[PDB]
Design an enzyme around this catalytic site. Structure first.
Site, PDB file in Angstrom:
ATOM      1  N   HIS A  60       0.822  -1.202   0.000  1.00 44.86           N
ATOM      2  CA  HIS A  60       0.000   0.000   0.000  1.00 44.86           C
ATOM      3  C   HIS A  60       0.859   1.256   0.000  1.00 44.86           C
ATOM      4  O   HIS A  60       0.577   2.212  -0.731  1.00 44.86           O
ATOM      5  CB  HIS A  60      -0.928  -0.033   1.209  1.00 44.86           C
ATOM      6  CG  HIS A  60      -1.738   1.208   1.392  1.00 44.86           C
ATOM      7  ND1 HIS A  60      -2.664   1.638   0.466  1.00 44.86           N
ATOM      8  CD2 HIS A  60      -1.772   2.106   2.402  1.00 44.86           C
ATOM      9  CE1 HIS A  60      -3.227   2.752   0.898  1.00 44.86           C
ATOM     10  NE2 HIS A  60      -2.703   3.058   2.069  1.00 44.86           N
ATOM     11  N   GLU A  63       2.363   1.756  -3.464  1.00 44.08           N
ATOM     12  CA  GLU A  63       1.361   2.244  -4.399  1.00 44.08           C
ATOM     13  C   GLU A  63       1.117   3.736  -4.227  1.00 44.08           C
ATOM     14  O   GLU A  63       0.740   4.419  -5.185  1.00 44.08           O
ATOM     15  CB  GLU A  63       0.072   1.449  -4.205  1.00 44.08           C
ATOM     16  CG  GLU A  63      -1.100   1.884  -5.059  1.00 44.08           C
ATOM     17  CD  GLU A  63      -2.152   2.646  -4.278  1.00 44.08           C
ATOM     18  OE1 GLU A  63      -1.924   2.951  -3.090  1.00 44.08           O
ATOM     19  OE2 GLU A  63      -3.216   2.941  -4.857  1.00 44.08           O
TER      20      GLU A  63
END
Ligand SMILES: CCCCCCCCCCCCCCCCCC(=O)OC[C@H](COP(=O)([O-])OCC(O)COP(=O)([O-])OC[C@@H](COC(=O)CCCCCCCCCCCCCCCCC)OC(=O)CCCCCCCCCCCCCCCCC)OC(=O)CCCCCCCCCCCCCCCCC
Ligand SMILES: CCCCCCCCCCCCCCCCCC(=O)OC[C@H](COP(=O)([O-])OCC(O)COP(=O)([O-])OC[C@@H](COC(=O)CCCCCCCCCCCCCCCCC)OC(=O)CCCCCCCCCCCCCCCCC)OC(=O)CCCCCCCCCCCCCCCCC
Ligand SMILES: CCCCCCCCCCCCCCCCCC(=O)OC[C@H](COP(=O)([O-])OCC(O)COP(=O)([O-])OC[C@@H](COC(=O)CCCCCCCCCCCCCCCCC)OC(=O)CCCCCCCCCCCCCCCCC)OC(=O)CCCCCCCCCCCCCCCCC
Ligand SMILES: CCCCCCCCCCCCCCCCCC(=O)OC[C@H](COP(=O)([O-])OCC[N+](C)(C)C)OC(=O)CCCCCCCCCCCCCCCCC
Ligand SMILES: CCCCCCCCCCCCCCCCCC(=O)OC[C@H](COP(=O)([O-])OCC[N+](C)(C)C)OC(=O)CCCCCCCCCCCCCCCCC
Ligand SMILES: COC1=C(OC)C(=O)C(CC=C(C)C)=C(C)C1=O
Lengths: 454, 496, 54, 79, 164, 176, 55
Positions: A60, A63
């Protein structure tokens, strides 16, 4: 009972999806469409599930930092270049799949491929960018800054999959977020973002040959493969309860109940899609053309009558599929005093599939399922998601005609057989947040998966 | 083209008399009841989804979509595009919005929306809604300031039925007294749905303040007090006779065969008389400007909007002012946008990046046939209102000049927005229907792109100067206890 | 030739009444017709003795 | 195949009042857009549970009145 | 499938591989082999599918399941063609008569030249559909067509490789 | 399975009678036997039994209505669900006079009195409720066909209702 | 409503009302409900003095 074939000539009139495997192992899939806009992106077979407990949250974080500058660009230059092309870069991260897709015009297709390749292959994970994102991720991590639908989505996985990595959340625990560094992200890129796990999807005014040539040129230096994933047994489904009783957050209670579902490639997956459609969704604040009291949906109609007030402020079914497991259930947002009626009715509805489901309800559900699936394929991004998600899930894209062909075979009897085998007298997991005095024990709710009648 | 209507040429579809016996043969097959059945085990019960099962598929037949225009003999215009999708979007637009209401007719446009899909001459209310449901169709009715739209999204195979149901709302509606009385509930729901959306609520306040008790200002929703006196079937019918006519209606269809749609629509009007077209009072909007400070005791945030009058959709300023909106762009702290999502708009760079106390700053550009509103919308904490207004005023004073890089970026982003928005079918349907109602013509996305490329800095300066000469409209919503007075805003903009 | 909306409006169930309705339906002004006993006739004279004790 | 839309169709107009396909911004990410792809602040997947109806929930609002009661009147034993 | 039995991935792999080799090893040409075995194969195949559903994407179990499905498809398809060939040859034998004399002889297939054109087309269709099962296709259908060739002189591609 | 076969029989027998004209919309010529019966029995039976008996009853009914001062349609009991659904939609003018007549009738009947003859010269058989009875039946038939075509399953004895179909709480003995 | 039932069935022996109305099927139709004559302001049939004169 069989009532004929609903496949039409128009279903066959769709441009084919051409999928080719590059020598490095990267699949390139494209579909031509008569549009002036396109969507080109990379659907990767990475996610939180494929992270370890100590590194959960790295994917995460990565990203969130992949578009903050490359080794050949800077954040300002990169953002300026995309804006000049009249394009926008998007990205998401899930448990099992990830994507980095750009929505651009026709002239920005190949230029955007270059931008995405640079971000994925040469990310400049600057420390300053990481530290600023650490604050943003930490603030988001706070449950006060998370919606109750997001909270219960995560807690359903935590409760159901205590023994495996699917229970991990995408954002990760706060302890890991506090400690993630560039080296963590660099390792994750090296191990997971490999050619064998990537699919380049181009939808729009595109030519397969040209896309393939550009893809091979730009992704030449990608790592060809990584070691095969460790073989594991079926994710064990834990029939548990994770309820956060809070009588200081208002009158509305949020309750999610889950059964064990089926994997993507299961022969029964389409049956579970239809069962999800039969459950449907209902909101008192958006009832539609048909009122609840006169709805064809049996759950909605009976619920709308309870106490002359209605026992469902909101509810929706959910059917979540992973490579080797799935979750099937419903989510409820209802008044505190109505929770017992609400969970009781939706469980009675799911139990009814195994005893008394009418052909009428099935046929209506087929049409609304097909009306939802086809409408999702209207824009290029919708098509691109469908191609990328379907190749990762199945290794191929199911045509609309094939989906309708397989759905034609499914009838009330088939739904009854599947429900009797998997959902009747089955173990359930309940999760909730809010005023939940009316929520009974798990064993009490689990007895409602079978009937004394019939 | 056999007929030219308001600048567009249409092919005239002629009414034909056909027997019910012969048309019945062409109605899509569907059953409501399944009384028995032929058992057949699921043949694919043991076939995993990763294994293809369909063979000998007919080769696809792809055609480049083209917009085709036809008109019936009753005067109803039919405009359709077929992108070869599997779900259709049928919509009926009528040129009867809130702007055509007289003060004694307040709210009647909304009332028409509330009574949509109720009993018709050949179908009860229950049978209309149960059919739309069993066929898996979604839709509804929305009444705007200039038009009212009836939309249904459906699987293309069932278009013959949907076309009939939509048209029956305007052809032979039975406004039965006890069915209309059951629709009084929708007024309160509509008010709650509007006020929930703070941006749309502040937009309603802008228009009411901008145009004082005239066309565009006219409230969009009916009140639930004195307006209920004329919330009657008889009153609604009189309103429909005044404004609803085949000449003011336009049936748009996306992902539908034009020749088939025209046939079924022809059959729907062939044996019936549509509402005759009569002249009506059409007055140009009067822009007064002004200010309104609405308090929401529950909100701690202050929403401020400063707007100016624009000539509208039919002017030559439409494309330049839309470039100005993209040039100023804007954003919100709530959203975390990646590359290409307005991070380099003037408002984002000059307001959001430099003022941590600003919660959100955006530019707005509403457009109607002969008038519109352009301005800035900024939000923050209540005590910050004096500084928020100053920030907004300073940005308005910077519209005198624009850099070449900003103009090019705005033009490219606008073209990207046009093409990306167009691919959505519901958006395309609403764009076409609202275009024809406003102008009688449809400008394609590509043609708009050509216009966008021709916008120069001189055009932006000229349009901005005209906007800033108008009397400002100044709306504050939420915590208004610290906002400046309207005269402060006026004096600041008096220099411009 | 009438507009369809106007034609169907005439067939509201309220627009049909039986022939001779206004000339036949009884419109009562009281539940005690003239010549029937009521409290005015049964009231005791104002000089009557108390009827509570009995 | 995946389902990309909520089981409850909106049934409302996408474009806002007075806003066109030319001046609505970019509907994919604009804040006022009714079809903006949601934000993955905590990851992807929560949209399967999300309530996309804009109006906030009013707990206990009645929807099961068949016309038997006026607003504000409390039924007693269902009568 | 309706069952409460639970199996590990190792047990699932073992069951699937056992069934795959059992089917691929059994002699398909002998009809009694398929008639007797298919009932047991179908009961096992249902259990294998249920326990291998999680492992459809597995790198070891997945390929076994795919091959197992393909083998069953080829087994049913080949058996069908050879069943028709057996019907044609038994019609021909009955036509010979009792003791070969012709005494009580049945009437003899008249579209035999055309019935041999149908079978040969089916044989070639099987070869294309199941390219990785040619040894089994030749054992059953190929040899069947060689027997028919001894009765009627017809041409098929592999006739020369069957000594015709 | 023998149930699956019965389902095909039922499906095929109903598919073969779709669109059939109802028995009352078929032009029907009476059988010769019935014609002879309707020329010997019916005439005499009407002149001697039916005619006189049914005139005797009808005239008495008219007199009873005139004595109460009510119309025939006033006599309908609202415990009948078609009558209730019709009374929902009657106009106020009809509704007001209907109530006053029924009130006067009950007063007279309770006090063992009769309407003065001066007020009795009216036709009590005027069918003023007919339009609304027909509308109510249409509404009910739509609900029957579109919403009650199957014996639905519901959770039993919950929310104050038995779950067997009734919609009012505390409307049965077992639901108290 | 309480447990209730209506005999809304397709009879085998009795015709529907739409085929054979049982009322005296003569009605007056108006364009609007207001155009109906007012019963309270309408003269009624003349009173009679003998029950054998009642209409
Ligand atoms: C014609 C007959 C055909 C016979 C076929 C038989 C056959 O092959 O069976 C397969 C046939 C079909 O099987 P299938 O296809 O799998 O379908 C399963 C269903 O059962 C199939 O049933 P279904 O789902 O169709 O349900 C219908 C069921 C319904 O059956 C009933 O309702 C039975 C009748 C009612 C009860 C009668 C009671 C009478 C009591 C009288 C008392 C009088 C008092 C005074 O019908 C039957 O049972 C058979 C009906 C046959 C005719 C068609 C109707 O199976 C059955 O018929 C099973 C019936 C049960 C002895 C030793 C005992 C222990 C001793 C210990 C001590 C020593
Ligand atoms: C019994 C089956 C059991 C199967 C296995 C278990 C699974 C099923 C369980 C439930 C069974 C329910 C009882 C069904 C009785 C048969 C009637 C039926 O459904 O006929 C379908 C169909 C009538 O369709 P429908 O449902 O009446 O729909 C037409 C309209 O509603 C209106 O029709 P329309 O007005 O146009 O037609 C005039 C109507 C006028 O008739 C009526 O009003 C019918 C009144 C009810 C008749 C009930 C008959 C009951 C017979 C029971 C037999 C039980 C055997 C149990 C054996 C157990 C062994 C263990 O005529 C009929 O309905 C003809 C009925 C002839 C029945 C012959 C039965 C022979 C039994 C041996 O009749 C046929 O065409 C087939 C006749 C032969 C049936 C053999 C069984
Ligand atoms: C000293 C004098 C003695 C005289 C003795 C005999 C007197 C008999 C009087 C009654 C019969 C008169 C002639 C009838 C001709 C045929 C009529 C016909 O087909 O009607 C269809 C016809 C249908 O037309 P509809 O206008 O559409 O009907 C609308 C209704 O609202 C219907 O409403 P829904 O839509 O809700 O439907 C309800 C359903 C309700 O139906 C049910 O509940 C069905 C189940 C019960 C009835 C049918 C099965 C009974 C048992 C049969 C045997 C089973 C053996 C099993 C063996 C198994 C071995 C393994 O009924 C129907 O649908 C219609 C049928 C009505 C029931 C009666 C059917 C049988 C008629 C024959 C009765 C017995 C005659 C015996 C003669 C003896 C020798 C003189 O019905 C009528 O005309 C109306 C009903 C008239 C009959 C009322 C019977 C009341 C109950 C008591 C009956 C017995 C009374 C005397 C007993 C005396 C000693 C205890
Ligand atoms: C001479 C012979 C003598 C025989 C002696 C023995 C007699 C046995 C009698 C058994 C009666 C069983 C209860 C009544 C019948 C079932 C009623 C029923 O289904 O109610 C549903 C209800 C509810 O069951 P349900 O079928 O609605 O299922 C809802 C979910 N659970 C199972 C969790 C309740 O049954 C009961 O409440 C019990
Ligand atoms: C050699 C000489 C031979 C002479 C043979 C002479 C045989 C004569 C036999 C006559 C039998 C007549 C029986 C009529 C029974 C009608 C019953 C009926 O209406 O069924 C009602 C009910 C239900 O009928 P239903 O559900 O079709 O509905 C009827 C409702 N109406 C009439 C309004 C349309 O019957 C049953 O439930 C069946 C019970 C038996 C099992
Ligand atoms: C040529 O005719 C005959 C056959 O065909 C080869 C037989 O199979 C057989 C062999 C069968 C048995 C029962 C011995 C006989 C006897 C026969 O007459």
């Amino acid at each position: 009972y069989y009532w004929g074939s609903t496949v039409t000539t128009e279903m066959h009139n769709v441009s084919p999806t051409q999928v080719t495997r590059l020598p490095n192992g990267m699949r390139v899939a494209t579909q031509f469409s008569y549009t002036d806009s396109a969507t080109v992106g990379l659907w990767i077979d990475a996610g939180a599930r494929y992270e370890t407990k100590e590194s959960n949250g790295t994917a995460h974080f990565l990203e969130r930092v992949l578009y903050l500058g490359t080794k050949n660009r800077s954040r300002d230059q990169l953002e300026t270049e995309v804006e000049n092309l009249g394009a926008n870069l998007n990205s998401y991260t899930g448990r099992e799949q990830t994507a980095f897709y750009a929505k651009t015009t026709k002239d920005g297709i190949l230029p955007c491929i270059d931008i995405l390749a640079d971000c994925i292959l040469n990310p400049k994970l600057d420390g300053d960018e990481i530290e600023k994102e650490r604050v943003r991720i930490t603030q988001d991590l706070q449950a006060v800054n998370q919606s109750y639908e997001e909270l219960l989505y995560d807690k359903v996985h935590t409760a159901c999959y205590r023994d495996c990595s699917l229970g991990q959340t995408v954002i990760g625990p706060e302890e890991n977020v506090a400690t993630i560094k560039r080296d963590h992200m660099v390792n994750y890129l090296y191990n997971n973002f490999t050619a064998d796990r990537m699919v380049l999807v181009a939808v729009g005014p595109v030519d397969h040959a040209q896309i393939v040539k550009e893809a091979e040129k730009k992704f030449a230096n990608i790592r060809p493969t990584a070691g095969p994933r460790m073989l594991e047994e079926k994710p064990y489904f834990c029939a548990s309860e994770l309820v956060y009783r809070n009588d200081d957050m208002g009158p509305t209670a949020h309750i999610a109940i889950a059964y064990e579902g089926v994997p993507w490639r299961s022969p029964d997956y389409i049956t579970f899609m239809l069962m999800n459609a039969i459950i449907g969704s209902y909101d008192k604040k958006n009832e539609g053309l048909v009122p609840g009291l006169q709805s064809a949906n049996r759950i909605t109609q009976t619920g709308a009558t309870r106490m002359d007030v209605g026992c469902f402020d909101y509810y929706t079914g959910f059917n979540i599929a992973y490579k080797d497991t799935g979750l099937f259930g419903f989510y409820i947002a209802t008044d505190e005093v109505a929770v017992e009626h609400a969970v009781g009715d939706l469980m009675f509805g799911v139990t009814s599939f195994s005893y008394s489901l009418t052909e009428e309800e099935v046929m209506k559900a087929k049409r609304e399922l097909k009306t939802n699936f086809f409408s999702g394929l209207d824009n290029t991004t919708g098509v691109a998601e469908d191609i990328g998600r379907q190749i990762l899930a199945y290794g191929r894209r199911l045509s609309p005609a094939e989906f309708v062909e397989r759905l034609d075979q499914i009838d009330s009897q088939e739904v009854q057989r599947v429900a009797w085998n998997r959902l009747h007298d089955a173990e359930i997991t309940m999760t909730g947040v809010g005023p939940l005095h009316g929520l009974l024990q798990l064993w009490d709710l689990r007895r409602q998966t079978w009937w004394w009648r019939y | 083209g056999k007929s030219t209507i308001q600048g567009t040429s249409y092919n005239v579809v002629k009414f034909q008399q056909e027997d019910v016996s012969e048309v019945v043969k062409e109605v899509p097959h569907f059953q409501f009841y399944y009384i028995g059945g032929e058992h057949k085990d699921n043949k694919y019960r043991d076939v995993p989804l990763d294994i293809p099962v369909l063979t000998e598929a007919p080769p696809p037949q792809l055609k480049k979509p083209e917009m085709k225009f036809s008109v019936l003999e009753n005067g109803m215009r039919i405009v359709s595009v077929d992108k070869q999708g599997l779900t259709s979007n049928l919509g009926l637009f009528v040129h009867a919005g809130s702007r055509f209401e007289t003060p004694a007719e307040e709210g009647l446009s909304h009332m028409v929306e509330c009574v949509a899909f109720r009993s018709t001459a050949h179908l009860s209310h229950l049978r209309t809604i149960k059919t739309i449901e069993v066929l898996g169709m979604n839709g509804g009715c929305q009444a705007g300031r200039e038009h009212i739209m009836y939309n249904l999204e459906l699987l293309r195979e069932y278009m013959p039925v949907a076309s009939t149901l939509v048209v029956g709302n305007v052809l032979f509606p039975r406004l039965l007294p006890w069915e209309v009385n059951a629709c009084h509930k929708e007024i309160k729901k509509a008010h709650e749905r509007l006020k929930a959306d703070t941006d749309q609520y502040v937009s309603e306040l802008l228009h009411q303040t901008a145009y004082h008790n005239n066309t565009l200002g006219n409230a969009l929703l009916a009140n639930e007090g004195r307006a209920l006196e004329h919330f009657t079937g008889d009153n609604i019918r009189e309103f429909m006779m005044k404004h609803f006519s085949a000449e003011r209606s336009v049936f748009v269809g996306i992902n539908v065969d034009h020749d088939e749609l025209c046939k079924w629509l022809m059959r729907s009007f062939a044996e019936y008389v549509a509402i005759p077209n009569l002249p009506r009072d059409e007055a140009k909007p009067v822009y007064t400007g002004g200010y309104k400070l609405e308090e929401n005791a529950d909100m701690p945030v202050c929403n401020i909007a400063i707007g100016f009058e624009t000539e509208g959709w039919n002017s030559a300023d439409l494309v330049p002012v839309t470039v100005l909106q993209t040039l100023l762009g804007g954003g919100g702290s709530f959203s975390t946008g990646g590359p290409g999502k307005g991070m380099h708009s003037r408002l984002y760079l000059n307001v959001l990046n430099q003022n941590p106390n600003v919660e959100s700053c955006m530019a707005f550009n509403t457009q109607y046939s002969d008038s519109g509103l352009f301005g800035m919308y900024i939000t923050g904490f209540g005590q910050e209102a004096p500084r928020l207004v100053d920030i907004a005023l300073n940005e308005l004073r910077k519209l005198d000049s624009f850099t070449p890089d900003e103009v090019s970026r705005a033009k490219n982003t606008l073209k990207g927005n046009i093409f990306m928005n167009a691919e959505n079918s519901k958006v395309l349907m609403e764009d076409i229907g609202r275009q024809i109602i406003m102008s009688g013509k449809v400008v394609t996305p590509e043609e708009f792109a050509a216009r966008v490329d021709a916008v120069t800095e001189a055009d932006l300066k000229k349009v901005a100067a005209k906007l800033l000469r108008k009397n400002p409209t100044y709306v504050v919503y939420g915590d208004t206890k610290s906002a400046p007075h309207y005269e402060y805003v006026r004096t600041a903009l008096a220099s411009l | 030739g009438e507009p369809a909306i106007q034609s169907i409006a005439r067939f509201n169930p309220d627009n049909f009444r039986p022939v001779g309705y206004a000339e036949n339906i009884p419109c009562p002004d009281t539940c005690v017709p003239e010549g029937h006993l009521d409290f005015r006739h049964t009231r005791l004279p104002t000089w009557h003795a108390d009827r509570r004790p009995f | 195949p995946p389902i990309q839309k909520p089981l409850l169709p909106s049934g409302r107009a996408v474009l806002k009042h007075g806003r066109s396909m030319l001046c609505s911004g970019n509907l994919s990410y604009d804040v006022n857009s009714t079809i903006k792809a949601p934000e993955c602040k905590r990851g992807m997947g929560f949209t399967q549970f999300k309530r996309f109806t804009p109006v906030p929930i009013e707990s206990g609002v009645s929807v099961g009145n068949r016309g038997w009661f006026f607003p504000g009147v409390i039924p007693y034993q269902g009568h | 499938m309706l069952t409460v039995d639970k199996f590990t991935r190792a047990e699932a792999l073992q069951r699937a591989s056992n069934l795959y080799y059992q089917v691929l090893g059994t002699n398909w040409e002998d009809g009694l082999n398929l008639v007797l075995d298919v009932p047991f194969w179908e009961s096992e195949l249902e259990k294998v599918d249920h326990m291998c559903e999680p492992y459809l994407c597995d790198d070891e179990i997945g390929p076994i399941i795919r091959n197992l499905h393909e083998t069953v498809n080829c087994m049913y398809a080949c058996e069908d063609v050879r069943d028709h060939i057996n019907e044609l040859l038994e019609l021909s034998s009955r036509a010979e008569g009792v003791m070969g004399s012709g005494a009580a002889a049945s009437e003899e297939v008249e579209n035999m030249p055309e019935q041999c054109g149908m079978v040969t087309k089916a044989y070639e269709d099987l070869l294309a559909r199941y390219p990785e099962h040619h040894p089994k296709i030749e054992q059953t259908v190929g040899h069947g067509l060689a027997v028919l060739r001894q009765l009627e002189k017809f041409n098929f591609k592999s006739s020369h490789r069957y000594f015709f | 399975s023998f149930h699956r076969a019965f389902a095909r029989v039922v499906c095929n027998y109903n598919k073969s009678i779709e669109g059939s004209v109802p028995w009352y919309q078929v032009k029907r010529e009476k059988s010769p036997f019935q014609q002879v019966w309707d020329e010997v029995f019916t005439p005499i039976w009407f002149k001697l039994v039916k005619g006189p008996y049914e005139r005797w009853e009808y005239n008495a009914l008219v007199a009873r209505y005139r004595g109460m001062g009510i119309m025939a349609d006033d006599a309908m009991n609202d415990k009948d669900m078609i009558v209730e659904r019709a009374l929902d939609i009657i106009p106020e003018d009809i509704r007001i006079q209907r109530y006053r007549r029924m009130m006067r009738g009950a007063v007279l009947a309770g006090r063992k009195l009769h309407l003065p003859l001066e007020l009795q010269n009216y036709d009590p058989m005027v069918p003023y409720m007919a339009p609304y009875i027909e509308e109510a039946k249409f509404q009910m038939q739509e609900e029957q066909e579109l919403l009650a075509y199957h014996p639905w399953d519901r959770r039993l004895y919950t929310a104050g209702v038995s779950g067997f179909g009734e919609t009012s709480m505390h409307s049965t003995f077992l639901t108290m | 409503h309480r447990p209730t039932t209506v005999k809304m069935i397709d009879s085998w022996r009795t015709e529907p009302s739409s085929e054979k109305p049982m009322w005296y099927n003569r009605f007056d139709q108006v364009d609007h409900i207001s155009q109906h004559p007012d019963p309270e302001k309408t003269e009624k049939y003349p009173p009679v003095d003998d029950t054998r004169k009642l209409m």
